[PDB]
Amino acid sequence: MPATRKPMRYGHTEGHTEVCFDDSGSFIVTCGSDGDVRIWEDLDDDDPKFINVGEKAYSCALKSGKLVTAVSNNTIQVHTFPEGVPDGILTRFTTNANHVVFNGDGTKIAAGSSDFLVKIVDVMDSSQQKTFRGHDAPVLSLSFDPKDIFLASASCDGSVRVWQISDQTCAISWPLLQKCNDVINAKSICRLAWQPKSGKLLAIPVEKSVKLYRRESWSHQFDLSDNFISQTLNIVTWSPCGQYLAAGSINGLIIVWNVETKDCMERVKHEKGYAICGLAWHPTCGRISYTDAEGNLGLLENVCD
Numbered sequence: 001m002p003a004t005r006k007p008m009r010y011g012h013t014e015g016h017t018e019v020c021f022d023d024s025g026s027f028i029v030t031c032g033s034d035g036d037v038r039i040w041e042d043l044d045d046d047d048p049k050f051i052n053v054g055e056k057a058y059s060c061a062l063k064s065g066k067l068v069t070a071v072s073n074n075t076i077q078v079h080t081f082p083e084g085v086p087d088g089i090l091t092r093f094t095t096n097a098n099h100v101v102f103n104g105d106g107t108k109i110a111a112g113s114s115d116f117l118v119k120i121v122d123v124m125d126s127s128q129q130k131t132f133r134g135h136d137a138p139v140l141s142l143s144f145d146p147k148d149i150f151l152a153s154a155s156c157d158g159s160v161r162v163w164q165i166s167d168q169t170c171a172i173s174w175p176l177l178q179k180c181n182d183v184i185n186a187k188s189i190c191r192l193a194w195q196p197k198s199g200k201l202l203a204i205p206v207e208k209s210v211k212l213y214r215r216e217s218w219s220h221q222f223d224l225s226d227n228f229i230s231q232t233l234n235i236v237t238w239s240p241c242g243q244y245l246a247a248g249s250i251n252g253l254i255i256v257w258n259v260e261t262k263d264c265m266e267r268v269k270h271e272k273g274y275a276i277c278g279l280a281w282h283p284t285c286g287r288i289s290y291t292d293a294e295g296n297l298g299l300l301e302n303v304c305d
Helices: none
Strands: 016-023 027-033 038-040 049-052 057-063 067-073 075-080 086-092 098-103 108-113 120-121 125-131 139-144 151-156 160-164 169-174 201-206 209-214 218-223 233-238 244-249 252-259 264-268 276-281 288-292 298-300
Touching: 016 057, 016 288, 027 057, 027 298, 038 057, 067 086, 067 098, 086 108, 086 120, 086 125, 108 139, 120 151, 201 233, 209 233, 233 276, 244 276, 252 288
Parallel strands: 016 276, 057 098, 098 139
Antiparallel strands: 016 027, 027 038, 038 049, 057 067, 067 075, 075 086, 098 108, 108 120, 120 125, 139 151, 151 160, 160 169, 201 209, 209 218, 233 244, 244 252, 252 264, 276 288, 288 298
16 A cells, blocks of 8 residues: 555745654654744644744754754754743854754754854753864755764755764765755755664765765765656655655655665655655654645655555
């Protein structure tokens, strides 16, 4: 039986919209350009709990009861979650940040901004910060190595780079992306993702494929492709076991692969063809939540049934 696509529902105003599951897996958590973070029981929840994090949210990450958001006063801030108690400011940039992520155990965050910088900050001690310098245009996306050795970044300068966290050096850079000056002009936000457990592979959406590179050697392993992908892939996310990978395209396609066998497990088309800009795998079940550039929220169930 194929994955069942519940009907998408309105989540936020139009614009970039992110999604994850809460720590328990019982809730879907979205954040959007209206500056709200919404907490949904499911897609039938007509009264989701809200956290007003600012006038506009660019990105949100959630781990172990800490909600970290990039908002339009150029700060990276913290709230407790789901309570929503303000818990301070972790760092700032001279412009907005475009992505913020937690590391594997939730003790660190990384953020990337339109002033080209990447910063890692200790969640419990904002005085502990590391800055990664080298990108020549806005940073689009970040992903932590689960082994806490490396951090990957994708940028409007056309590069995907891997950084060594301990000394902030650049271990490798692949010129895989199209160049542009502003995030609004990016063909793809290239929401790349490290493989969860071993971190053996880094998955990068590039044109109509997902490219898999091996850690430490930075060698290309193989690509995941499909005849149904007709427009650029925007975002990937792994199943928590590291065995499956989902990708979302700029024209609304969601596709799932078994990464070991490269078998295609699922394909789901967006009814209106909006770009997938948020995508998340449930922590324990075959369930994938996703959000699109129009602010809508969807849910796939019985994934890889």
